[PDB]
Amino acid sequence: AIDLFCYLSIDRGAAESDLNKIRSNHSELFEGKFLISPVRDADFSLKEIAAEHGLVAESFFLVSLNDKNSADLIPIVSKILVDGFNGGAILILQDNEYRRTSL
Amino acid sequence: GSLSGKPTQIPPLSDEVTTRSLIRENQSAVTLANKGYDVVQNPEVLGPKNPDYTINGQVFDNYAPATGNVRNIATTISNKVSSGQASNIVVNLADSSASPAAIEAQINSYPIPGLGKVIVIDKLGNITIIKP
Ligand SMILES: [Br-]
Ligand SMILES: [Br-]
Numbered sequence: 001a002i003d004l005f006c007y008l009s010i011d012r013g014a015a016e017s018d019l020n021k022i023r024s025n026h027s028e029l030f031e032g033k034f035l036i037s038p039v040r041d042a043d044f045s046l047k048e049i050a051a052e053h054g055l056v057a058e059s060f061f062l063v064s065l066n067d068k069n070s071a072d073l074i075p076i077v078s079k080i081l082v083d084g085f086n087g088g089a090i091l092i093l094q095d096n097e098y099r100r101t102s103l
Numbered sequence: 104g105s106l107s108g109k110p111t112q113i114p115p116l117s118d119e120v121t122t123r124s125l126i127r128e129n130q131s132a133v134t135l136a137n138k139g140y141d142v143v144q145n146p147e148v149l150g151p152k153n154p155d156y157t158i159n160g161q162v163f164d165n166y167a168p169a170t171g172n173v174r175n176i177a178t179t180i181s182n183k184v185s186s187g188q189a190s191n192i193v194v195n196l197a198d199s200s201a202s203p204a205a206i207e208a209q210i211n212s213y214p215i216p217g218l219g220k221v222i223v224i225d226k227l228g229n230i231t232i233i234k235p
Contacts, residue, residue, distance in 0.1 A: 001154075001165060003183055035151065064152075064187055068153075071117050071121050072114040096178070
């Protein structure tokens with residue numbers, strides 16, 4: 001199972017509002033091919049990991065690879081996410097290990 | 104032991120990281136089937152979700168940490184469960200330097216809500232079990 005761990009500098013509510021637009025702007029990926037979890041407030045553990053990669057996280061959410069045949073869209077999905085969180089910073093770690101985002 | 108269902112096809116354009124996680128998933132299936140489990144790869148199931156395996160009937164997912172940070176490995180599992188709705192996890196230590204022992208200790212001193220059966224495969228193909 002492949003999961004993008006996504007940390008955000010913005011709060012949970014705003015994060016979610018932003019994710020609605022993403023879901024609406026990329027129905028292809030995000031209805032079935034990738035599943036986007038609900039956003040949660042980052043606890044201490046997630047904040048710790050985000051801060052090792054430069055970022056002060058307030059919220060966190062997960063993106064699961066639901067269709068294995070689309071495993072090659074991870075980098076494009078990552079970019080779509082960086083862009084739909086304009087108003088803030090996002091760190092994306094594939095399986096909470098590999099940084100897919102800049103810096 | 105047994106192995107059925109279609110094994111995972113890795114898309115050509117996938118990079119080294121993604122490619123390696125799919126390799127390890129196909130590999131965990133074979134390793135377990137040869138240890139006596141009945142393994143079905145990419146089983147049809149009800150939810151919107153498409154689990155990796157079915158191991159003696161139970162839906163299971165593969166997780167192949169490259170990190171050696173045992174705490175982080177736990178944090179990761181925990182969240183795969185809470186946000187990803189995973190339950191039973193195969194943890195394949197092929198590319199990790201974290202000991203099977205240390206993972207078991209961690210998962211025990213800090214239970215992880217929702218977590219089901221965990222099957223560890225170490226670098227040598229030895230299976231240990233961490234029960235729900
Ligand atoms: Br293939
Ligand atoms: Br490390």
